[PDB]
Amino acid sequence: EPSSQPSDCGEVIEECPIDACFLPKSDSARPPDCTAVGRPDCNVLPFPNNIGCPSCCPFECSPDNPMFTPSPDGSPPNCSPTMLPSPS
């Protein structure tokens, strides 16, 4: 299906988020992470969307699931856009 995924750096590397989650996640705070509201059933990465989920995102995904701070410029993006100086 995808002939090109590792092209950004780590935004596109088997990463479950993407707009497939619901928008580019770190957009400006997309819908919550399911368990995060009380959907532990949605903690399952492959989305059931047929049992628990009221339209949030799942969990697990990759080694160490914590992710925080949205905004398109919320943090030093790294993987080249941070290499160049743009402090403030």
From TrEMBL:
Disulfide pairs here are C9-C79, C16-C61, C21-C57, C34-C56, C42-C53
Q: List where Pro residues composition bias occurs.
A: 73-88
Q: Which domain of life is it from?
A: Eukaryota
Q: What is this protein called?
A: HEP200 protein
